[model samples]
Target: GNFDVAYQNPDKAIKGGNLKVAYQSDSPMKAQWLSGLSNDATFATMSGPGGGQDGLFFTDSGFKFIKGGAADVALDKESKTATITLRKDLKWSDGSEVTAKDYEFTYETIANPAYGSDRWTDSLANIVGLSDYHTGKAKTISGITFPDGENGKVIKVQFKEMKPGMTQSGNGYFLETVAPYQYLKDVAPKDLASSPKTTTKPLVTGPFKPENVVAGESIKYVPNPYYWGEKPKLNSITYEVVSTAKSVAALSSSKYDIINGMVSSQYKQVKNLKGYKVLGQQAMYISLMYYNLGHYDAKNSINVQDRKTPLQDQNVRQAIGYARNVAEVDNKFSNGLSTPANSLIPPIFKQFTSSSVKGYEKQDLDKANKLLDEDGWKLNKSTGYREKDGKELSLVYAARVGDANAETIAQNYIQQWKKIGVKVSLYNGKLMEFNSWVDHMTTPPGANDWDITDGSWSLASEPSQQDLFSAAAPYNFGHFNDSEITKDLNDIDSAKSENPTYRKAAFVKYQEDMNKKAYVIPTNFMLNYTPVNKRVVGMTLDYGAMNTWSEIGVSSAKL
Candidate 1:
């Protein structure tokens, strides 16, 4: 059974019944706390049942930007500005009007260094006044301006440069969902994350309001009395945090109506399950192996270099790339569900994905051996392993422990690299736990930490890799710094490129440089197979990483 055909037609819709959903153990149902910031949490708090009443713009399941959710957008290239006109009647759950000041307050909070928001590096860095405000030189953001006589209808954002492409609204960096400034303005930045106003009693502008929330356990939602949009059909929605091991059992026993975060291992049991509809689609995320060049600390201005590691050499990285048999791993574990990705910019981004740049998809053992030999990693016949300057060709590798597919692939990769005279040690652990493996890897560079790490990024629709590749990007965990690529990437969103072709060319060049480096070994583009109860209608769930449970409703047939 598939939900696609029925999801396309609104006449087949259902109304009024509680929809029970489950999330992973690591994924929290809380509306607050930066500790639980993930795609699951983002849907629960910002985009899912809440905050749907107002937004500057909205992206559909296919990643197409559309108006009518919150604000109408207008772009003026000559003036280098993007104007947002808020929906006049929009109101928060607390019955307060959502105005332009909320946008300004969100900007102010994000740009303040004391706030410690991770969004500052990824989402707000490209804006004009961010650096000034973040460094405490400017009291307010200079780029955001409100029209004098229009009340709160209009908000104009001036960008340092217009992002290249029509999809590039302004610099593409200033765009974000508005927070409830009126309710949170008084909370200090340091205490804002833990405040009750944010956690338990959030003032939201979404279809549903917070009725009951048990921290880290479960959250219950009811239709917002003051919701500006069409009233949600479901009387109540409850999301309970369930362990991955118990997800299928809970769903099969009728304890859960909807389940997400299902993996490849469960496909066999759930594929033909009666009374359930299955939908699978590729997610926007990609997994890759990142080579740690060195560690650079932004807070203290420290750079630690370990020259002894083979990963520091470009030839060595290329050799490692050639050594990986990604296709084999994909076919064995994923049943061809996952595709081998060559570039970080996925195939979903049609024009931006480079056809000319080829990444490591095939295993080239001969080439790998040649590159290793050329890089002074000559084989020592007595020891049966390569050595350079009396140092054996040894390296550390790591991945999160719980993922079965990832762990299997890591083991396969370890055996393959071992055949090529390379010794690899594994450090698989829970990255989210206190004082965990990720803490050591993320810390300022040292010899004891890992040389390569497996990581994944859920990307926005825009082909922006600066957040992961740029030297200053905090998420650049590998410390991959290439000045030429950085300059090319920065130029893509520059004000000089008004024509789409120019912007496309800039990204192509950036991709070329990125592929040439081979610093990150692109692994696979994941596919999500989600199962929903057949009784539930209007369950449109095919948008991979963009999937949300907000729109689902119980059937009118009286289940």
Candidate 2:
């Protein structure tokens, strides 16, 4: 069932029990404990609230700062600074108190090129002196200062400019989570990713601590002896990797108490199962068809939009969007577990997503044909595809290897474009593996390896897409940038947006630009039906739920 903010599970809580869970993915888990370094969202789910990483500042339903978090933030706009005060009671699983250096170390590792972390982005560069430190122009980021030295309780971060997003969670104005500097200082930052400290035995500040980890297969977590919060009620929580193809069988066999990241195509099998609660909610992610218009400048950390392609033509791009039956794919293919997206912005950001921008919700075949013909893409009777200047309207597609659902979805779009006289083919005649796809997409082997690709973006609590789309953002794999779009992006997060009226209007202007260009066509604002065993007590599938990890327990002794 749909939840307002959370599924208010109120079953009687028992003392202790093992909670078995599964994370469904087509590929083996990357097991990167450090959230900043990993791209996998399932690993993200593991490190959050109850899953163990645990240093996030609390926020209300709107993502505004709230009290009782691991740290407290106070923004001083006049000084362009935000001060963080860590909770004195908090300690890592090793019993060391979290300090300012832990916070500072997090920034240093991401910014320093020696670490090879792609976490550095325009938002992080917004911190004054960060770029200076990142580029070796300075020894340290002058903006981050400790009031009482390196182990101090207080840390002040000065920004190049105070943004409207500063007061919100995951704003990217500053780092919210802390690393264990005392424990990790000895390891070289370059080797830290694969190091045992990060892969299997990293210390945590959350209610649970890692007891055993089987490389990419599973993690057995016990209660954190040094946890500052209420003692966890569960005896242990076992999270194991399960493939999407095997998820339904695993769940039907009662092999897991809860499951995450199962694609919606399994809804038929999941709905027929008994003794579970399916918590469906509007997801905070957007799947899109992005056109690559240029290349990424890795050395300088910039997305350069200088290459030319037929996708550069507004009519050609718009025609492709109009030709797809995205709504049907979302509804029937997903078993009513997905929503046809209207804009690049997902519905989670109600204030920013536009009601006016009815972005290609239906397949307008007539309009698609008209736009192609008007833009000089004339259909050739002999070739059975459109051509311009004696060149076929041909393009290559790229996708990550996955289960039948992923393959079926891509083929559906490929066939739809064919109806519009557009010739499209797969990259390398096959789908690439996950890690290889990330490498190729981020740093294309060739300038134009593929003209189009499909992927999903997990939005932060805040609504700014600049960090992903800006000219300097490495994640902007499409490499499409415009002067006016850049200006609108800045305006959307500008300090003037401190007032919702200006921010709301700023969003409208940006959406209008995105809608007109159609460089990125959003396919779905996904609806997730998270299944939880009836044996589990009080699990929330909502954002910003106040329940502590310590209080979450299972009603039974077995999964």
Candidate 3:
């Protein structure tokens, strides 16, 4: 039985409380560390709108959702003091108390220098001493010192400056408190980037324990009986893995409950399934193609204007941008359910406008071809790839071609660019090697390979430019920088509200700057949909989508 769908057309109460919710994905489940290398592996931590890792802390309004969306945050204009209050009865899945200490532990752990995690180092750069800490040089951030008491258990951290994008307001995960000192003292200081201890059954203060994982099959979870909120209606939940094709087949045959990772082609098939419900929501992640400006062949990939390199000139990248047809791809590949994107911050969020940014609609193939021709292309009739002073405009794009979209889109891009005299080649490999290729390509300002690789950008509720474009940003692959992007980043960070003037100005300027500079291209917005049995009841879809078993309860049928 589904809460959302049932609640929607409701006059009578729903029966049959037992639910078996299932999901699927391609991202491998690596560990539990939210800030670790493969943190995307932990889908439950940050998927769906209302059910997510943060749901462990819950209230009527919603779980303590923070950092993924744009508004409902309060800010102090002057002292730069930010605070968020959890609604009542915050508890771990085990029914133990969930204190500010749990939040504090996570904050400090990510802020710790020894961790060296890309997510933390990139998104958390504004915290004082955060850079030093991530580089393994600082022991404690002087700015985040908890006010005197219980080893800082009741903690209150302040930043020296204010930015518009900071969403650590009344509730949500970013900048929230952590667990007690005694319990996590040792674990707090552990190497977050590479620690296996934190990965399996890590000292979680959330609503459920990751009790078991049946290798290569499924993960079984038991509700935290000690959970502070409403006890779970169900005994436990299982995250069972299945292929996109397999999931589609199973659902069509009534052998599955829900299917995830559906490409554009699978939408109709799933929708046509008779009894089974199908749902999809836009997860806060964006799919993209990265043009490496600093690879040697893969070298010189970072500097945007290198005369000798293929993507070194901004015009060249822009030319390629114009030549490719995103609309066809969006409709054909994205199932007409997704929106084309130009900024990492999807437009669905408040205060987002692609028009505020420049070049977002700058699509003209004649101009695109002209830009490349001016860049020095003596077309070689033999190879068909553009050449400037003997250097071939050839680049390698390595991806998991086995996946539906990766291969389809790569071929589409290659074909379009070839028409404009640019030689783009595709290199497909095994999953592990593909991972290596992606890692090597996007290694921030240095150690990059391949130009314009396939990628994605996910945003938490609170906005974080540090992760995407900060000079210290680990997520930055093309190594794009502009003084304005940095300055607006600070402005967004220092802001506390979503007012027309405050949030509007900073975000608009930020998007404008990124578009003008062409730091990264826009693709489309994702809509995540879910299908549930009509019998399930009383469910909500909060935007940050990670929650636990305890936030739900079932009552007898009203009928």
Candidate 4:
């Protein structure tokens, strides 16, 4: 249920033709070549020739540190420090020797205010002296020390406090990738993102280097000449923009060698296609229904929670959760590949996922009606819906456009809620495109007419939930505020959580509490499928498991 499946041509890989690939996106990619300045998750995932990154370290299946990596790390619990040593002979895309200064430059680039990057997060803040640097109080972070010089291969980082997840990849304590400091050193911070060095000819430590890059449409990559790993099996890899609608049709005609991000809406048609093998990976993602309970104070950088809607009552929110048939939508529209989610934590992370959280997986109209009646809404309604104090219970829902059957899924759920005497309709009487939906969802409570919006999240390998749900997190669109939630979220990443038992218990507590609150209801949990021509070889869909993307091969030149 959770492993990478391999595909081969059986006649032996030829390693000549360019690997043709389609990257999924409803809108044009910002194509801000570097992840630090892009401020877009889609661009980050597709950074290194699609589904690869210039990572400093590698990890095993559960995200534990592995030895065969360029960077070696040793953490001292008592001193709250991590000493990192870069291996010699590791070269950048331009064949320059990578050094300790590259790592230091990465932190300074994202932390420096003049760069205008949204990449700084809670993890970066945990670094000692980084906070002062972010606020323009310090010219350089005093906590990072180079053993010999900027060109030295050793770096020691000082942290305010040691964290439990620090031993894992995506550890949330420091940056896991480096930039070519010498190449981009001369560019001013404000101009770094827009510079041709970053946009047109960015350097990398990954398997492939960009030979051609179109602003929003495509990228052509050839094997990096100075790559430290094995020689690339494919001569070239090309990725072009694609939408959900065109994926199946393009793959059917053999237009591309592979289709990544293949949606389930057209799964049945592509599932048993003749020339391709469909590979599936359990997505580290969750679709959520978020309620607008308050507004974010942008100036103060805090959430100002003030719930004036009927959803303020826990019973009403839970009742609505029980009324929606998530399974029906998955079965009818998505071919059951995305089933009803049972917990806030996706099931792939076996350790942190809570078994006790009941996510209203089964639709129960009887329970929903009873709860609504018990709350203040009466069945005798005006304006064709449930009412309290002569006011209709009509709420505006913001639905996104992209999926082949997006409108059908939205209407089906709206009809289910109507069965319980609740009235919900699409906002602006139409579906919102990806860009506009994301813009509004970022500041949800500020949008006066929006009552609910739903979207999916691609989670990191590490299991910490602090970045999205914590009190200070800007992405907590629901504006849910509670003292207990704050404590539980913080506790999972605290020093005490280094004890495996303590962290496990803390994770369970938060999941159970969130189930009771029901402010954000879990919807469908997705399993991503990629259809590849059997000629492509040595490709992996799993995270942190592949040793080299350079080994990705092609069996045939004439696909």
Candidate 5:
């Protein structure tokens, strides 16, 4: 049935010969016309908390800065600013120059409260005048100014404060800036303030120029002839958006030159196929339990959902953590390909790997049961739920259908908890429904409909976890109220410790505390796999290092 399903929808896994792609959608422009989800109605969907405000850092083709490795970016600590000098040979898709102003515009727009950008401002917040800038009290942030360079050809920014996250790997690109002054200043003020699609043609400095965007059909790009480094071998690429099932099916059919979404179910099926190869990479993302501590109205414990609870109860929360086995979940659901995650900081990141914290790794059901029993939770054998003096030890775990693997893995976890005599139900549904639940959680005084849910988060920067669990942070999904977590996060970000060990140790202590509270339970990291046609060559797998669009090269058989 699966094989037949694939063949029936030619457009599902369709590739080559125009590479038609099929994605489930009721709207013609899948990415366009998205309504406001943040508290600020004026902010673009691409901006604000967790919005990934900086999108232009890696759009350019080649000669991106790397101090030691070609993949690394360089930062100038003295100036507290970082600049990526495009290889001299590099040119924008339109042959126009890309310099500092593009980036300046990005930061300026983001810092402008008028723009309603909510990036948590780790870098911008630390800058000398960013606070006044964000509140609209100041017209220009003091420390952030672009010094005109190389006949205004050079794009350089000077920060008043050093960015700690910009160490060895360089300023994280996902957190970097890309501003287009000339394009947006006069022409698209309303569009720039509201939507990213204001301008159609990208004055892109990337290796390839966008050729066409057929609404939700496909995004085509042609190589930039003026690219700096080795010219990309590929002539053009048609990034066709196919469904997860379709992407996997494309592998065997040899229809896709390259497909991006990788599923655990499809791993063995496609990896063993002839003319195909599988590559593995350490994941920079994390999946965790988004817990809403039920500290609100006890009368409405069954309905009145309070997003923030006295999540400080170390014993009760820790008990929940010890109930599930991270290792077993990964093995059974992920084919033994995923790494067990125990901390918020991804293993690949340098901040949280030390002996002091050692990542809260273990699954001791006995310890969990003991803790729950100590806290007055009596297991009800009939319903598989626990009741403590009448309160049921139950939670509604919400996950989205778009991420089926996560949904399946979460279901597996519920089964594990059931063994420990805890009641759990799955409320798997669409993203919009999940979004509404999140919105309700953010209600001022806080509500607690969601007890504990399953979701994943990505942190490309060092200080981002603060925004996730911090008290005032807009992105605090759980509305987890913890002044100490907020304080430690700020200390690490704002501390003047020259000793790397001291800073990391501080993080260790903070991590230990966070784990103890169990506001967020760490699951395993996720590895992304992409399937490609054998005809393609010279492309390599990059573990969340940078966007792979510019790195992969496609070649004709003749070449």
Candidate 6:
């Protein structure tokens, strides 16, 4: 029988026990400093109740934005301005009030070039004076007017353009929370990545603060003395690193109160276990292949040829897509829970998905062969692989080590591609090393390496890909360049000035172009299956794993 699920009442909840959680990675030791830039750091912020630390807004379990620590908002649709008023009562963990100055400082630090944060996006650039501030043309953002002045609680932001989809709450352009500028004011932007303030004992606004950290081993939290919200129910939270091989046993033996990122292979066993329930939902994450289109030199504004192979050819990319058997891969590896993703937009955002591009969803060896042959890649009888201009059709594939499913998927591709006379070499390593390899590959074209890197990405709820697919986007590892694609991405944001319908149409066109180009071959859209102990209540998985933890609380009835 299913357990009752409802909103937890803190007044009646158990208040003293430590919540033990099992996590896979202990990365971004100083996650608070990086903000939303790293996944590992996000875990630290989202894990416990009252964790947001007096943000402007908080999203409920269903992902709808709600006013929380912040006081009020006033929108000026005619002038394209938003006035944000902070709560006079909200305070930091240090017993200091969270003011408008904190918000101003945060914007300046993120906009500074030295920090190199991924959170600075085209949408944020829509802020009237942010671009100038980022480029050092202005000392302070002119558009951000503190009506009450620096220490004032009111912040007024003026946008250069108005959009039909624009709203006062949870606007993509504005961040939800402000960092503790009072504590971190001395940390230089360039030194922030290695600052001790971020790593050792950083000040925070959450109900819980870092009590102890065992380097990469584990982290323990205790109640924040200066927490201004409803008292936290949990006395502490301990997140211990756990491996996949030991996770099932730990959960079954009641060693862990919560276990996330459950592998699909263990779904049946966990679901069948008594006194436990498996909470699963479709996520925004979609696994895909990011092709390296050579190296890009920012200074020279030129692309240097990286690969000696003919992957630069559009027909070759299209052929490779046709050769992939996505359905078989999903059924065999993902327990048939994965959806074949034809575009970058996951099906969860079905309205944004384009129908113009009939992607390579089905396997057609005949079509693959035709595309290859038409591209002048004649089959070499002796070598048993296609060749063009005396170059063999071979690729070096990269996948993260220790990920069983990714390895299996890559192996499947190697097997399928071989039938079409394409040779593949596998290079597997840890996530950090893989990221380093990708960084090098995305550098100047002539100095690049690798053909493709395998991984999945989870984007925020904002329906904008301007930052991801843009030619100069930091995350555009492949340096994919298409004038039409770039134009469509730009037009999507431009259409935002007119109406939602126009903006949505532009988005569809951009995705359609991406599909036709085949710059990325999406494998599948994933579903997050999390196993929770019966004692846990009010926990719900939203678009992804990180969004679910804040609602979790100990039920007094169970305790």
Encode model 5's per-residue lDDT on 1-559: one tens digit a residue: 0111011111122122232222221222333211121232112211211112223333221213333211223467666665544334434456655555665566565555445444433434655676677666887656544456532434444556564555532232223435445555674444553454432344444455556656545556566565444454445565554555465556666666555445555666666776544555544567777676633221221212244432335666777778777777667666655666767776656555654554436778888788877777878877876677877776666654443465566667687677766766765433324345544554434444556666655444343355455554545555555667767776665536346666676677677877876777876666655554544443444433343444344333310
Query: lDDT value for candidate 1?
Result: 0.66
Model 2 is weakest, by summed lDDT over 10 consecutive residues, at 47-56
What's the TM-score of each model vs. the native? 0.88, 0.96, 0.80, 0.94, 0.76, 0.87
The residue pairs in collision within model 1 are 51-206
lDDT for each residue of candidate 2 in 1-559, tens digit (9 for 90 to 100): 3643344567777887788888886666677766566667777776653333455587787878988877899999899999899888878888899888988888987888887777787888789889889999999889999998887788999988889988888777788878888888899888987889987888888878888888878888888898766777888888888988789888888889889877877877897888777777777788888888887777777777776789989998899889888877767668876777778888878877768887877789889999999999999988779999988999888966776767776788888899989988888988777767766776542346688887787688788888788878777877887888899889988878889999999988888888788878877788777778877777876566655466677776433
Q: Pairing residues by index, what is the TM-score of model 4? A: 0.94
Query: Candidate 1, after superposition: displacement of residue 487 in Å?
Result: 2.1
Query: How well is each residue in 256-355 modelled by candidate 1, as lDDT tens digits?
Result: 7667666656667776677777776556677788887777665743333334467888888888888888888767766555778877777767677766
**Highest-scoring model, lDDT:** 2
lDDT of 3 at 93: 43
Please report, as a residue range, the 10-residue window in candidate 1 with the lowest summed lDDT.
Answer: 33-42
lDDT of 4 by residue, 95-169 (tens): 898898898888877788688665566667889888888887888898899987888888999999899888887
Report lDDT per candidate: 0.66, 0.80, 0.52, 0.78, 0.51, 0.65
* 1 versus 6: better TM-score goes to: 1
Lowest summed-lDDT stretch of 10 residues in model 5? 1-10
Q: Give the per-residue lDDT of model 3 (tens digit) for 361-439.
A: 4446788788888877666778876788868877666544434665676677778888888877755333224345545
lDDT of 6 at 328: 85
Total colliding residue pairs, candidate 1: 1
Clashing pairs in 2: none
Which ranges in model 1 have alpha carbons more than 4 Å from their true place?
A: 1-15, 25-47, 52-55, 60-64, 122-126, 148-151, 165-172, 300-308, 428-448, 495-498, 542-551, 556-559
